[PDB]
Amino acid sequence: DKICLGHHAVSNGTKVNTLTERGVEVVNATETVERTNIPRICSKGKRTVDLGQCGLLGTITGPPQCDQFLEFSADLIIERREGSDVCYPGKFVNEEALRQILRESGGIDKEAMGFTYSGIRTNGATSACRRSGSSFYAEMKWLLSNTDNAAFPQMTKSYKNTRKSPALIVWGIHHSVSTAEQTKLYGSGNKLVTVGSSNYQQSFVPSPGARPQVNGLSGRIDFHWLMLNPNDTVTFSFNGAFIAPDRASFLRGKSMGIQSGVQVDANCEGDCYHSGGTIISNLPFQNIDSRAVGKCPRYVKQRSLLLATGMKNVPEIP
Amino acid sequence: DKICLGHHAVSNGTKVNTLTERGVEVVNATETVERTNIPRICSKGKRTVDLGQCGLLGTITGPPQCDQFLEFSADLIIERREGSDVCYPGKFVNEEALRQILRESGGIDKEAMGFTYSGIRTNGATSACRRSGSSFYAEMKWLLSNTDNAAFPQMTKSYKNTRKSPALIVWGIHHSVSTAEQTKLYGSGNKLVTVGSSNYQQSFVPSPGARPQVNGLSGRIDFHWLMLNPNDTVTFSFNGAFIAPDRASFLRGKSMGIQSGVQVDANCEGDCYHSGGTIISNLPFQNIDSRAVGKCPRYVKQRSLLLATGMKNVPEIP
Amino acid sequence: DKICLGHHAVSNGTKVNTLTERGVEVVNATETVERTNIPRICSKGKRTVDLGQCGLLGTITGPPQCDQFLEFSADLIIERREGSDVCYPGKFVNEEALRQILRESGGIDKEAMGFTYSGIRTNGATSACRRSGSSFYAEMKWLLSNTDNAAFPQMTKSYKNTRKSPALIVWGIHHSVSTAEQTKLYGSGNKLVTVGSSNYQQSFVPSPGARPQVNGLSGRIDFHWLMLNPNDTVTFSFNGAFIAPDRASFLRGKSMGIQSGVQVDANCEGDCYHSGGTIISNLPFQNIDSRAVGKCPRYVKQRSLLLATGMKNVPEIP
Amino acid sequence: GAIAGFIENGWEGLIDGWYGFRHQNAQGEGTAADYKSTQSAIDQITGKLNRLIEKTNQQFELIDNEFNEVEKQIGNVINWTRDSITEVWSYNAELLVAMENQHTIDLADSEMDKLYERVKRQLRENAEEDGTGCFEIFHKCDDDCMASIRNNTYDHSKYREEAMQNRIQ
Amino acid sequence: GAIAGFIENGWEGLIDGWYGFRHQNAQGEGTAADYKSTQSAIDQITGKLNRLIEKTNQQFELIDNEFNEVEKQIGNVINWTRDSITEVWSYNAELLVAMENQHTIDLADSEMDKLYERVKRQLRENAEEDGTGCFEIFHKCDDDCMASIRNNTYDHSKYREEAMQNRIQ
Amino acid sequence: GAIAGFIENGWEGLIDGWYGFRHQNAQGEGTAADYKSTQSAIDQITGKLNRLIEKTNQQFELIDNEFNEVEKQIGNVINWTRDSITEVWSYNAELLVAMENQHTIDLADSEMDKLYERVKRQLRENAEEDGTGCFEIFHKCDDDCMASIRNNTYDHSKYREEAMQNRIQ
Numbered sequence A, B, C: 001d002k003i004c005l006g007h008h009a010v011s012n013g014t015k016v017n018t019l020t021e022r023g024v025e026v027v028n029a030t031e032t033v034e035r036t037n038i039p040r041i042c043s044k045g046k047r048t049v050d051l052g053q054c055g056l057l058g059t060i061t062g063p064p065q066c067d068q069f070l071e072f073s074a075d076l077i078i079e080r081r082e083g084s085d086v087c088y089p090g091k092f093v094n095e096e097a098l099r100q101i102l103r104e105s106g107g108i109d110k111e112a113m114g115f116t117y118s119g120i121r122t123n124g125a126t127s128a129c130r131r132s133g134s135s136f137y138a139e140m141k142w143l144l145s146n147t148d149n150a151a152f153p154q155m156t157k158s159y160k161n162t163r164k165s166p167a168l169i170v171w172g173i174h175h176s177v178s179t180a181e182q183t184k185l186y187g188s189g190n191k192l193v194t195v196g197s198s199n200y201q202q203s204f205v206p207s208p209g210a211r212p213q214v215n216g217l218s219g220r221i222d223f224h225w226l227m228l229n230p231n232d233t234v235t236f237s238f239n240g241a242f243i244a245p246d247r248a249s250f251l252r253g254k255s256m257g258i259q260s261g262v263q264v265d266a267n268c269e270g271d272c273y274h275s276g277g278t279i280i281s282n283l284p285f286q287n288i289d290s291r292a293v294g295k296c297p298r299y300v301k302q303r304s305l306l307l308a309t310g311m312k313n314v315p316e317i318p
Numbered sequence D, E, F: 001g002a003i004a005g006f007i008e009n010g011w012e013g014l015i016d017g018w019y020g021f022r023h024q025n026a027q028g029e030g031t032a033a034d035y036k037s038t039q040s041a042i043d044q045i046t047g048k049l050n051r052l053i054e055k056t057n058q059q060f061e062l063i064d065n066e067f068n069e070v071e072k073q074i075g076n077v078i079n080w081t082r083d084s085i086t087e088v089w090s091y092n093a094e095l096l097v098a099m100e101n102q103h104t105i106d107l108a109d110s111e112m113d114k115l116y117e118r119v120k121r122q123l124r125e126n127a128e129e130d131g132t133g134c135f136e137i138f139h140k141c142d143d144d145c146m147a148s149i150r151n152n153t154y155d156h157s158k159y160r161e162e163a164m165q166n167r168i169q
C-alpha cells in the first residue's frame, strides 16, 4: 500500500524569467505590459471638443476656424494637426506655456474689456481672415490711422479684472512688409507699444520688412499674453502697429488636453490617452507610447514581461 | 512526557503588507513614513538670518527694508512672504536664477566700484524709498541730467574685478510714466544703455509709458545682473534712464535658503526644512512636503508604510 | 561507519551586504561598480574628429581655426577646452542648443546661398581673423557702405532650401565700439535687420558702445541661427551692421559629441565616454562620472557594491 | 506500474487542483486533490495580482508638442528626463517580475513540502519514505483508510501494531 | 489539558522571548524561552532597521518658488519632473516594505523550523512527533532532563534503551 | 578524530566542488564532491551574473557643458534632475545587491539541505542523524558502499536486516 504527494503539471507550459533562470517554464502566466491599443478617443462621461482646424490658441484671438469655440466648455480637449492658431500669418510668444494653460482650463469665458476709440479706424481687415468677405480676428481690433499715412494718435487704454479669477489678455504687434506700409497704416516715425501691470512690464517695437508670403501675406502679427490677477489692472500705451483685444478670457475650471489623429468615441470610457488612441488596462505597464497622458500605466521599453501565476512546470515521467 | 517548540504571540497585533497578503498581522511593526512636523525653523548650530520684509534680491540693491542685510553673513537664509526686493516699483530680469545664487552664497560682501560723475545729478530720490525723507536704493545711483529737460551727456564707466571670486553687478533701467517725464529727467532724443564684458553682451532701451500705480508710482525700474569673472572688466555706456551701481557684491561662501511662514528656534537642531517647519527623522521617507529641502528623507505619496519588526502573529488556541 | 554532508569554505573570505547583515562573509564575490577608467578616447570603428582649437559652432561660421572642418564628416565629435567659436569677439544666441544639434549631425555639408551685392563693400576684414593677412569668417560676409560714412542701401536677400533636409542658416549683427564707428561703416541713422521665414520671425538692432578689449577689439559680433525647413525660404531685410552668410549648412547624418581633455586612441573600442576617457565595462554601474555619455552603466554614489558569487563562508572547526 | 509523487515529475492528470494525493491499494489506483494547500497557493498568487492592479491616482499632462516641436534646449532636457525615467521604470518592471516569479515558484515549492511533511506527521511510525515523494504504508490501507489520510482523520494508533510488525520484520 | 507548539497557534504566555520550550512531566507544566533562536531573529530584524536608517548625504536646494511662481513652461517641466520622481520613490517605498516584510515573516518561520529540527536531532530515537510541534518523549524526563534538552546537554544514549522499549511495545 | 558535516563549520579541504561527501569506515577517511548539487548552485549564480550583464541600448547625450557653463536656471534644473536620478540608481543598486546576496546565500543553504535530505531518503531505516550533518550507518559500509551512496545506487534493502538489528540492540 502506497500514498504519494504531488502537484499538477502541463505540456502547455509557458516560459518566464527569474533572478536566476531565463526561460524557466511555469504552469501559468499573464502579461504585465499592455500593448493592446484602442485606436479611438474614448470620451464617454467626458465633455469633449474636437478643435479640428481651430488651433487651441486660436480660441482666444478668434480666427474664422475657431468661431464655434470662442467660449467653449470641455472636460477633454483635442488638438488636431490640421489646426491653426492663425488667419493672418504670425505666432504667439511663449506659445507652449499658453497651450498648457488652456489644455486644463475647462474652456474659456469671454468678457468685454470696454475699449473705445476716437480719431482712428478699427475696421482693419485682411483677405487671409475671410469671413463672408475680408475680415479679422474675432476678439481683436486692427487699429489704423484714419485715412492714409496720417499720424496715429498716442493712446492709453486700461482694464481692471473685477473678477476673482485671473484674466487672460492677448494683444498683437503688427509687422508690415515695408516701412512704407507701416507709414501708410499708422503714420511716419518710430512706433512704441508698452504694456503695464502690477507684476508685469514689457515693451514692443514693430519690425517692418520683407518676409516670405504666408497665406499670400508677407506681413506678420505676433501675439503676446499675460495673466491678470484679480483687481489688478493692465494699461496699454501705444501709437500704432498695435492689435488691441476686444474681450478678455477667463478659465472655466479643469480639463485635460491631448493631441490626436484618430476619431472620437463617446461609447468607450477611458482615462489614458495618446495620439494613437486610448489605453484601457489594469496592467501596471505599457509599451505603446511614452508620451501618453492622463491616468496611465508606466511606460517601459519591453514589449512583454510575463508574471508567473502558477507553479514551476515539471513534466511527468512517461 | 512531552516537550513542545513554540513562538510568542499577542492579541495586540498590528497589520502590515507583503508581496502576497494585505493586512497580515505581525507581532510588532514600526513606521517608515515620517508625518511628525516641527512647526519651527530649527537653527541651532546654523548662523541664521530672517530677512522678514527684505527681499533676498533687495540685499544687493538696498531698499530701506534691507539696510541691515547689505553685507549680511549666514549659514541659513530665510525668505518671508512679506519680503519685497523693491521700493521703487520694478522687478529683476532672471530673478529666480539670482535668488538661487544668493541662497547658497553664505551672504554678501560689498565693495565700491568707484564711479565718479560730472555734469550730472546723482541724487535721484523717490517717495517710495522713504528713509527719513525721500531717498533711493542704498547701493544704487539715480542719475539725472542736471536742471530739467537738459541733455544727458554720453558716459562710459568701467570696473575691473581685482578679486579671486566672481563679482555680482546689478544695474537698472528706468521706465518713465511718459516721454515727457523721460525728457524732463534725461533730456530729449532716444536713449541707449550698453553693458559689455568679456563673456557678456547686452543692450537696453527705456520704455516710457503709463502703467498702473504701484506704491503711488506708475514708473518702473527693472534691474539687470551679471557675474564678473576675476580680472575681467565690465563697461557701461549710457546717456540716460540708467540706474548705476555704487558697490559690487561678492559671495562669502556656502549656505542654504528656504521660504517659511513659521518662527525660528535656535534650540532645535535640524537639517531638513519646508515652509511649515523642520523635519527631524531617521525614517527613510516622509509625507509632509515634496518640496522640502536640505538633507531629507524621500517624499512619498503614502502617509503610512508599516515595517514588520516582529514575526507573523498567530493567536493561541483557547 | 559514518557519512557526512558538507560544503566548501575558505579562510580567504570576502564580506558583502544583505537585507539583514552588514559584512557577512561569503566564499566569493565580484564588483558591480566600475571604477576602472581608460584615460583615452577609444575611437576604433568610429570616424573621429578632434576640433582642437576650433569651436564646434566655429565650423559653421569659419574662423581660421576651423578651416579644416568647414565640411567635416564624423561619427564621433570631440570638443576641446582650447576650442573657440570666434575670431572677431562675440557669441552665439542660443549657443548650447546649436551645439547639441551639431554634436549629433554627423558633420556638415555646406552649400552656397547665392547672394549678390551692388553699391557696397563685402571685403570687411579684421586683425583678429588673421589668415595670412587680415581677414574674416570664411562662411560670412562683412558688409560695409562703400567709402566711409556713406549711406548703406536698404537691401533684401532671400534663400530657398531646395533640399529635403533642414538648412542651418547663420547671420551676425555687428556692434561697433561707438556710434561714430557704426556711422563710418554703415552710415548715419538707426539700423534695422529683419529675418523672415515661414515659422520664424525675429528682428535685430545694433548696439554701439564701448566694451572691454577682446583680441584687441572692443566690438562684438553676435551670431543668430535658425533651421530652414525644406522648400521654405528665409528673407533678410537690412541696412547695415549685418553679417551675411555665404553658405548654408546641412547635417550629414548621425553622430555623438563629447568634451574631453585626454588623447585619442584608434586601437581601443568603446561606447561610453567622459572628459577623463572611456569606460569599457560589462558592469551595471559606475562611479567615474555622472555626466558620462554614450551607452553607459548607470552612475551611482557608491564606489563599491560586492555581489556574492559564492555561498556564505563558514570556517571549519579546528 | 509504480506511482511517484513530486521529486522528478509532476502530474498532468491532476486537473482539479494544484496539489494532490495519489495512492495505490487493493482497490487499485486513485488520485485526489488537496484543497487547503491548493487554496493557499492560489490565494497568494491572486494576492500578488491585486497588488499589481492597484492603480495610480497621479495624472500627467503634456509637457511638449508633437505637432509644433518645442525649443531645442528645453526639448532636449525634457527628452533626456523622460528617457531617464523610462530607463528607471523599465528596470523596475524587469526586476519586479523577476523577483515576484522567483517568489511565486519558491512559495509553490514550499506548499508542496508542507503537504508532504504534514502527511509524514500523520502516518507517524506506520510508514516510510520511498524517496519519490511517496510513503510506503506498512499496513492495509483501503480506500476508506486513504480518504482518512486526506481529510486528516487518520489515527496512527489504530494501525501501529500491524505496521511496526511489518516494518521490523 | 494538553499542550501544543507551533502549527496552528502561538503562545501569548511566552513573554521573555520569541521562541521557546513548553513541556509537561510529573513535575507539571513549564515554559521557557530559547536565547540563541530569539537572538538570531532579533539581530536580523534590527539589522534591517539600521539599514533603513542609513541617511543620505545628498543635499537638495530650492528649484522653484512658492511666493513668486516661476515661469509657466519651466515651472510645469519642474512639476512634471518632481511628480515623476515622487511616483518612483512612492513605488520603491511600497515595494521595499512589502519585500522586507515578506522576508521578515519567512526568516521568522525559518528560525522556528530550525529550533524544531534541532530538538528532533537531540532526541534521536527516543521520541516521536505528535504533529503539533511537540515531541512525545518515550522515557521519564524530569525538570532536569527537560532543562538538559534546552541547553543542548541531552545525551540520547542515556535514555535509548528505555525509550526504544516503550516505542516498540 | 571525529568527522562533521554542515551545521557549525564548512570544509576548507573540499576544493573540487561546493557540496560534498565525507565518510569514515574501516578503509579510513575520504572526501568527495557532489556534482549535481554543486552544478545547480553554480548555474543559478552564473544565471544572476548574465542577468546583470544585459546591457542597455539607451544612448544618452550631453545636456549641459563643462567648458561653457549653461544658464543658471536651466543649469540648476538639470543638476537637480540628475542628482535626483543618481539618488534613485544608487538606491536601486544598493537594494539590488543586498537582495541578490540574501537570495544567493539562501539558495546555497537550500542546496545543502536538499543534498542532506536526499541522502537521508537513500539510507531509509539503516542510519541515524548525529546532529552534525552526518549519518551514523548501522552496518558495514566499505568504500564501494560509500560510493554507492554518492551516485544514488545504494539499495537500502540489502543492508536493512543488518542495520535494524544493530539499531534496536
Ligand SMILES: CC(=O)N[C@@H]1[C@@H](O[C@@H]2O[C@H](CO)[C@@H](O[C@@H]3O[C@H](CO)[C@H](O)[C@H](O[C@]4(C(=O)O)C[C@H](O)[C@@H](NC(C)=O)[C@H]([C@H](O)[C@H](O)CO)O4)[C@H]3O)[C@H](O)[C@H]2NC(C)=O)[C@@H](O)[C@@H](CO)O[C@H]1O
Pocket (backbone or CB within 6 Å): A123, A124, A125, A126, A127, A128, A134, A142, A144, A175, A176, A177, A181, A185, A210, A213, A215, A216, A217, A218, A219, A220
Ligand atoms: C512683398 C512682395 O512680395 N513684393 C512684391 C511682389 O508681391 C506683392 O506684394 C504686395 C505687397 O506686399 C502684395 O500685396 C498684398 O496682397 C495681399 C494678397 O496676396 C492682399 O491683397 C494685401 O491687401 C490687404 C489684404 O487684403 O489683406 C488689404 C487690407 O485691406 C489691408 N488691411 C489693412 C488693415 O491695411 C492689408 C494690409 O495692407 C497688409 O495685409 C498688412 O501687411 O492687406 C496686399 O497688401 C501682393 O499680393 C504681392 N503679390 C505677389 C504676386 O506676390 C510683387 O508685386 C512684385 C512684382 O514684381 O513686386 C514686389 O515688390
Ligand SMILES: CC(=O)N[C@@H]1[C@@H](O[C@@H]2O[C@H](CO)[C@@H](O[C@@H]3O[C@H](CO)[C@H](O)[C@H](O[C@]4(C(=O)O)C[C@H](O)[C@@H](NC(C)=O)[C@H]([C@H](O)[C@H](O)CO)O4)[C@H]3O)[C@H](O)[C@H]2NC(C)=O)[C@@H](O)[C@@H](CO)O[C@H]1O
Pocket (backbone or CB within 6 Å): B123, B124, B125, B126, B127, B128, B134, B142, B144, B175, B176, B177, B181, B185, B210, B213, B215, B216, B217, B218, B219, B220
Ligand atoms: C500717471 C497718472 O496716473 N496720470 C495722472 C494722474 O495721476 C498722477 O500722475 C502723476 C504723474 O505720474 C503722479 O505724480 C507722481 O506722484 C508720486 C506720488 O504718487 C510722486 O510724488 C512723484 O514724484 C517723485 C517722487 O516723489 O517719487 C518726485 C521725485 O523727486 C522724482 N525723482 C526723480 C529722480 O525725478 C520722481 C520721478 O519724477 C518719478 O518717480 C519717475 O517716474 O517722483 C510724482 O511724479 C501723481 O501722483 C498721480 N496722482 C494720482 C492721484 O494718481 C492724475 O494726475 C490725473 C488727474 O486727472 O491725471 C493723470 O494724467
Ligand SMILES: CC(=O)N[C@@H]1[C@@H](O[C@@H]2O[C@H](CO)[C@@H](O[C@@H]3O[C@H](CO)[C@H](O)[C@H](O[C@]4(C(=O)O)C[C@H](O)[C@@H](NC(C)=O)[C@H]([C@H](O)[C@H](O)CO)O4)[C@H]3O)[C@H](O)[C@H]2NC(C)=O)[C@@H](O)[C@@H](CO)O[C@H]1O
Pocket (backbone or CB within 6 Å): C123, C124, C125, C126, C127, C128, C134, C142, C144, C175, C176, C177, C181, C185, C210, C213, C215, C216, C217, C218, C219, C220
Ligand atoms: C575703444 C578704446 O579702447 N578706447 C580708445 C583706446 O583704445 C583704442 O581704441 C581704438 C578704437 O576702438 C582701437 O582701434 C582698433 O584697434 C584694433 C587693434 O587693437 C584694430 O586695428 C581695429 O582696426 C580694424 C581691424 O584691423 O580689425 C581695421 C579693419 O579694417 C576694420 N574692419 C572693418 C570692416 O571696418 C575693423 C573695424 O573698424 C572694427 O574692428 C569694428 O569694430 O578694425 C581698430 O579699430 C585701438 O586698438 C585701441 N588701442 C588701445 C591701446 O586700446 C586708446 O586709443 C585711448 C588712448 O587714450 O583712447 C580711447 O578712446
Ligand SMILES: *[C@@H]1O[C@H](CO)[C@@H](O[C@@H]2O[C@H](CO)[C@@H](O)[C@H](O)[C@H]2NC(C)=O)[C@H](O)[C@H]1NC(C)=O
Pocket (backbone or CB within 6 Å): A028, A029, A030, A309
Ligand atoms: C492563467 O492565469 C490567468 C491570469 O491570472 C488566469 O486568467 C484569469 O482568470 C480569473 C478567473 O477566471 C479572472 O478573474 C482573471 O481576470 C483572469 N485573467 C486574465 C488575464 O484572463 C487563468 O485562469 C490562469 N489559467 C488557469 C488554468 O488557471
Ligand SMILES: *[C@@H]1O[C@H](CO)[C@@H](O[C@@H]2O[C@H](CO)[C@@H](O)[C@H](O)[C@H]2NC(C)=O)[C@H](O)[C@H]1NC(C)=O
Pocket (backbone or CB within 6 Å): B028, B029, B030, B309
Ligand atoms: C516594536 O518595534 C519598535 C520599533 O523597532 C520597538 O521600539 C524600539 O525599541 C528599541 C529598544 O527599546 C529602540 O532602540 C528603538 O529606538 C525603538 N523604536 C521605536 C520606533 O520606538 C519596540 O521595542 C518593539 N516592541 C517590542 C515589544 O519589542
Ligand SMILES: *[C@@H]1O[C@H](CO)[C@@H](O[C@@H]2O[C@H](CO)[C@@H](O)[C@H](O)[C@H]2NC(C)=O)[C@H](O)[C@H]1NC(C)=O
Pocket (backbone or CB within 6 Å): C028, C029, C030, C309
Ligand atoms: C569568484 O567570482 C568571480 C566572478 O564571477 C569568478 O571569476 C570569473 O571566472 C569565470 C570563469 O573562470 C569567468 O567567466 C568570469 O569572467 C570571471 N569573472 C571575473 C570578474 O573575473 C571567479 O572564478 C570566482 N572564484 C572562484 C574560486 O570560483
Ligand SMILES: *[C@@H]1O[C@H](CO)[C@@H](O)[C@H](O)[C@H]1NC(C)=O
Pocket (backbone or CB within 6 Å): A231
Ligand atoms: C482693488 O483695487 C483698488 C484700486 O484699483 C484698491 O484700492 C483696493 O485695495 C483693491 N482691493 C480691494 C479688495 O478692493
Ligand SMILES: *[C@@H]1O[C@H](CO)[C@@H](O)[C@H](O)[C@H]1NC(C)=O
Pocket (backbone or CB within 6 Å): B231
Ligand atoms: C588681468 O587683466 C590684464 C588686463 O586688464 C591682463 O593683461 C592680464 O593678463 C590679466 N591676468 C593677470 C593674471 O594679470
Ligand SMILES: *[C@@H]1O[C@H](CO)[C@@H](O)[C@H](O)[C@H]1NC(C)=O
Pocket (backbone or CB within 6 Å): C231
Ligand atoms: C515649394 O514652394 C513653392 C513656392 O516656393 C510652393 O508653391 C510649393 O507648393 C512648395 N512645395 C512643392 C512640393 O513644390
Ligand SMILES: *[C@@H]1O[C@H](CO)[C@@H](O)[C@H](O)[C@H]1NC(C)=O
Pocket (backbone or CB within 6 Å): D069, D070, D071, D072, D073, D074, D075, D076, D079
Ligand atoms: C524629443 O523626442 C522626440 C521623439 O524621440 C523627437 O522627435 C524630438 O525631436 C525630441 N526633442 C527634441 C527637442 O529634439
Ligand SMILES: *[C@@H]1O[C@H](CO)[C@@H](O)[C@H](O)[C@H]1NC(C)=O
Pocket (backbone or CB within 6 Å): E069, E070, E071, E072, E073, E074, E075, E076, E079
Ligand atoms: C507646480 O506645482 C504647484 C503645486 O502643485 C502648483 O501650485 C504650481 O502652479 C505648479 N507650477 C506651475 C508652473 O503650474
Ligand SMILES: *[C@@H]1O[C@H](CO)[C@@H](O)[C@H](O)[C@H]1NC(C)=O
Pocket (backbone or CB within 6 Å): F069, F070, F071, F072, F073, F074, F075, F076, F079
Ligand atoms: C551643475 O553641477 C556641476 C557639478 O556639480 C557644477 O559645477 C555646476 O555649477 C552646476 N550647474 C549650475 C548651473 O550651477
